[PDB]
Design a protein around this ligand. Structure first.
Ligand SMILES: CCCCCCCCCCCCCCCCCC(=O)O[C@H](COC(=O)CCCCCCCCCCCCCCC)COP(=O)(O)OCC[N+](C)(C)C
Ligand SMILES: CCCCCCCCCCCCCCCCCC(=O)O[C@H](COC(=O)CCCCCCCCCCCCCCC)COP(=O)(O)OCC[N+](C)(C)C
Ligand SMILES: C/C(=C\Cc1c(C)c(O)c2ccccc2c1O)CCC[C@H](C)CCC[C@H](C)CCCC(C)C
Ligand SMILES: *[C@@H]1O[C@H](CO)[C@@H](O[C@@H]2O[C@H](CO)[C@@H](O)[C@H](O)[C@H]2NC(C)=O)[C@H](O)[C@H]1NC(C)=O
Ligand SMILES: *[C@@H]1O[C@H](CO)[C@@H](O[C@@H]2O[C@H](CO)[C@@H](O)[C@H](O)[C@H]2NC(C)=O)[C@H](O)[C@H]1NC(C)=O
Ligand SMILES: *[C@@H]1O[C@H](CO)[C@@H](O[C@@H]2O[C@H](CO)[C@@H](O)[C@H](O)[C@H]2NC(C)=O)[C@H](O)[C@H]1NC(C)=O
Ligand SMILES: *[C@@H]1O[C@H](CO)[C@@H](O)[C@H](O)[C@H]1NC(C)=O
Lengths: 693, 61
């Protein structure tokens, strides 16, 4: 009767002793809501396996004989051949279906769990928060008794049909969702989110159009997107648990998740969170909801009778708890403590630390950092002759997350070291020079450009000495820089650079980019032209007009870092645009009746639109025709009815599913019965890739 | 294209976002993705987001 017991569902006396705590955490509860959540989660993962896990693209990702650089968490892991991987994904699909239908539930959970984590750990570049969440949910549900309501296993076994479940099944899931929301909220107490920098361009979307009717865009990008996000994180964490606030919280969270789903392309995360939101309701809502149906509907829906006793719960008359009862409470407490601690475990695993905190995926810092890379240079020195050469930025790689983490860079360096001898290169030394800015700051180096990464020292628990610190002393400049961005014309472009003392940047201005200038904002640098070996020492507020088509160098020779800017206009692009505008003006003058004289021979293809029975068109004519064709195609695309777009979307998804199933069938046949003739394989591959139509 | 030229390697002032958008639009796998990127923010911002559901894979396909 006490208000504390009514609000929180338990009295303090239940926490007096361990036995009473176990009895509280193992009290009876209705099994319906857990069953509904099981069905929704299983169905969503079944739909998600052929789309995001990569069943359709697996044939061009783990192709045999191809030399690519993987990024596994453990170097001991190695991918298996493609056929065995397809078998693993088939086991994943079977486990997901079994969880959805509740048939051999524990085996289904295990068969989904072990492959999923194996795939998740195999490639660090495919880590995201929602994949980690799906993994954690699958791990949790392996122990939970979710096969008690609306399950085929119940029909196959009467003892586990419409029976009670212990209370900790709901408690662990509620704690997980609360931890997700609360950690997401608290992580967003950073200067780059409360100030509106991260995701600043989300306020122009048409979904925010009604908000603009009362607020300006600049304020709408701060009060609504960011502050609304933080407040909604905390509110979704806390409101749903209490009785009075459930309706408003459900409405806000549902609308928030729908808007997030339509704004972003995260995938199935928003739908899974929508499925999890009802879990805070009473544990018996589906049963009483079904009770409000006519007799005919009830004949096929699950049972409406009251639940029967179970054997994995403590019933009060005294019943002595067994062993599973205690282990349930122990698992609940330890798992919740581990979930709380893991996001803040970055002070132990400092080898993975960078400008950001730890690897991406297990911190719930969703959409809080944005990065803009400017350049990536890979230099190699041959170990026998002394030659110096340059590799392509992204060779032997399938992702671009190696530009932001030291460990991935080390693995990439080792991969290059082992693979380069296939191209007549002896034992090399590899140097990296990468330019990146986070949340619209000066472009600065992220890694030391003088350190051989192959021979560099890296361990998981020790800080790296070749990761440049993030210079936040240049943070307030983000105001003034933005103003400079708004005072330029449609052709001029500006690139901001912040450089460390002693290091120098070597650049080659292309022949097209005439009218390029360098200006110093803070510090003291020396700009050297190598054609005549002449350098000028620049002070603040001085500008130099650099050569176009040669190399220059900029050296920093001050006690502190120097910030400067490159301002350029593509002269070739301007000339091409002016010539195209002149040609368009002549075409319009001819069309509207002016210029009565005969058209030039080169203009004849333009009006005709097809070069048939005549000399080949000039490059300018080709460019004009291509631009007109592209404009017409874009215009046709924009003026497209919604039903056609929806039909194309459905057809494309059907193609993806069909390709996945056919490739899996071919792989399984090859694995079981062996390999048929090569021409048959080519024909089958052609058949699988065929568009449905 | 494993080895890149000395002259072409040292080009800091080469449009990352414009080049990526042009490559995506020209590529058959893009076009619609290239058009969305042009209408939307730069693809570099999308990559910096890091939560996209295989944005590179979707653009390739
Ligand atoms: C000697 C050793 C002594 C013990 C030391 C260890 C002490 C550990 C204390 C922490 C663990 C406490 C476990 C409590 C379990 C419990 O009560 O489970 C649940 C608690 O609910 C949860 O699952 C909560 C998960 C966390 C979500 C965030 C809660 C926010 C609370 C804010 C302050 C109030 C009982 O709820 P119920 O399903 O019966 O629903 C009743 C309430 N309504 C109607 C509103 C939905
Ligand atoms: C009680 C309820 C409680 C609340 C529950 C709330 C959650 C329920 C979720 C249940 C699942 C609903 C369906 C989800 C569909 C879905 O997510 O669609 C997709 C994924 O799902 C699919 O594509 C499903 C495809 C099914 C294909 C079925 C084919 C059937 C063919 C039938 C014959 C057609 C014949 C045609 C020729 C005549 C997500 O789209 P996306 O990631 O590309 O993002 C779309 C939008 N953008 C790109 C802008 C971001
Ligand atoms: C991009 C944002 C958050 C990142 C994110 C994402 C993508 C998620 O998938 C999450 C899922 C679960 C938990 C946290 C998640 C998360 O942090 C800002 C959010 C933008 C959104 C449009 C805010 C809208 C606020 C509503 C309209 C209320 C406004 C209140 C009044 C002005 C009406
Ligand atoms: C132009 O000025 C720069 C300013 O430092 C000179 O550079 C340094 O150059 C010397 C001689 O080449 C090197 O020994 C130093 O190591 C350089 N400094 C750094 C920090 O790397 C440069 O030599 C001048 N140009 C000419 C042609 O003399
Ligand atoms: C190159 O220099 C700058 C861009 O690098 C531009 O010059 C502008 O020149 C016009 C001429 O009236 C001024 O109104 C602008 O204020 C200038 N912009 C500045 C100073 O940022 C232009 O793109 C090129 N100029 C020339 C002469 O080639
Ligand atoms: C400078 O502007 C020009 C404007 O044309 C850009 O160039 C074209 O450049 C692409 C490479 O991205 C070539 O494939 C095309 O053939 C060029 N167009 C022609 C010849 O009409 C150019 O990329 C810009 N940047 C630089 C560094 O020059
Ligand atoms: C030289 O290197 C190239 C790179 O593949 C190739 O011709 C071969 O590996 C080398 N040739 C000889 C004769 O060593």
């Amino acid at each position: 009767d006490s208000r504390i017991g009514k609000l929180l569902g338990f009295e303090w006396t239940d926490l007096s002793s361990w036995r009473r705590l176990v009895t509280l955490l193992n009290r009876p509860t209705d099994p319906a809501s857990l069953a509904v959540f099981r069905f929704l989660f299983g169905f969503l993962m079944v739909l998600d396996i052929p789309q995001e896990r990569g069943l359709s693209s697996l044939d061009r990702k783990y192709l045999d004989g191809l030399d690519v650089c993987r990024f596994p968490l453990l170097d001991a892991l190695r991918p298996l051949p493609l056929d065995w991987m397809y078998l693993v994904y088939t086991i994943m699909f079977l486990g997901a279906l079994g969880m959805m239908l509740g048939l051999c539930y524990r085996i289904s959970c295990v068969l989904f769990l072990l492959p999923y984590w194996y795939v998740f750990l195999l490639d660090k570049t495919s880590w995201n928060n929602h994949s980690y969440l799906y993994g954690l949910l699958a791990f949790q549900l392996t122990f939970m008794d979710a096969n008690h309501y609306w399950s085929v296993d119940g029909l196959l076994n009467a003892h586990r049909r419409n029976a009670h479940v212990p209370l900790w099944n709901y408690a662990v899931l509620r704690g997980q969702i609360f931890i997700v929301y609360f950690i997401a909220g608290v992580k967003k107490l950073d200067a780059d989110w409360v100030e509106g920098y991260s995701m600043e361009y989300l306020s122009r979307h048409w979904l925010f159009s009604p908000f603009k009717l009362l607020l300006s865009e600049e304020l709408t990008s701060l009060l609504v997107v960011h502050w609304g996000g933080l407040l909604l994180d905390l509110s979704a964490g806390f409101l749903l648990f209490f009785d009075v606030s459930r309706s408003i919280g459900l409405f806000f969270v549902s609308y928030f998740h729908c808007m997030n789903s339509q704004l972003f392309s995260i995938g199935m995360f928003s739908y899974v969170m929508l499925a999890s939101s009802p879990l805070f309701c009473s544990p018996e809502w589906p049963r009483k909801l079904v009770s409000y149906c006519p007799r005919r509907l009830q004949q096929l829906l699950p049972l409406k009778a009251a639940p029967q006793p179970s054997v994995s719960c403590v019933y009060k008359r005294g019943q002595k708890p067994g062993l599973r009862h205690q282990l349930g409470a122990a698992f609940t407490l330890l798992y919740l403590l581990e979930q709380l601690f893991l996001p803040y475990s970055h002070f132990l695993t400092q080898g993975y630390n960078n400008w950001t905190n730890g690897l991406y995926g297990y911190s719930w810092d969703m959409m809080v950092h944005s990065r803009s890379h400017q350049h990536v240079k890979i230099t190699y020195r041959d170990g026998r002759t002394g030659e110096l050469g340059y590799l392509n930025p992204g060779v032997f790689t399938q992702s671009r997350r190696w530009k932001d983490h030291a460990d991935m860079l080390k693995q990439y360096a080792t991969c290059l070291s082992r693979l380069l001898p296939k191209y007549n290169v002896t034992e090399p030394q590899i140097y990296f020079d990468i330019w990146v800015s986070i949340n619209d700051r000066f472009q600065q180096r992220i890694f030391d450009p003088r350190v051989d990464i192959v021979q560099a020292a890296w361990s998981p628990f020790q800080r790296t000495s070749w990761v440049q610190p993030l210079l936040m002393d240049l943070s307030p400049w983000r105001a003034k820089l933005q103003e400079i961005k708004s005072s330029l014309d449609n052709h001029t472009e500006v690139v901001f650079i912040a450089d460390f003392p002693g290091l120098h940047l070597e650049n080659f201005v292309s022949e097209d980019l005439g009218n390029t200038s360098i200006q110093l904002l803070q510090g003291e640098v020396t700009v050297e032209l190598v054609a005549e070996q002449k350098n000028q020492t620049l002070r603040e507020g001085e500008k130099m007009q650099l050569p176009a088509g040669e190399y220059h160098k900029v050296y920093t020779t001050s006690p502190s870092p120097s910030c400067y800017m490159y301002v350029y206009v593509n002269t070739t692009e301007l000339a091409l645009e002016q010539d195209l505008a002149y040609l368009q003006e002549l075409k319009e003058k001819v069309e509207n009746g002016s210029e009565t004289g005969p058209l030039p021979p080169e203009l004849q293809p333009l009006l005709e639109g097809e070069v048939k029975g005549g000399p080949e068109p000039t490059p300018l004519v080709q460019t004009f025709l291509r631009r007109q064709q592209r404009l017409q195609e874009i215009e046709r695309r924009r003026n497209t009815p919604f039903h056609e777009r929806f039909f194309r979307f459905l057809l494309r998804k059907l193609y993806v599913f069909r390709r996945s199933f056919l490739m899996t069938c071919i792989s399984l046949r090859n694995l079981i019965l062996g390999r048929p003739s090569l021409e048959q394989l080519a024909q089958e591959v052609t058949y699988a890739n065929l568009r449905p139509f | 294209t494993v080895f890149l030229d000395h002259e072409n390697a040292n080009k800091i002032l080469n449009r990352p976002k414009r080049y990526n958008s042009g490559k995506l639009e020209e590529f058959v796998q893009g076009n619609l993705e290239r058009e969305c990127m042009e209408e939307k923010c730069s693809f570099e911002e999308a990559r910096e987001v890091f939560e996209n559901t295989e944005r590179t894979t979707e653009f390739w396909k």
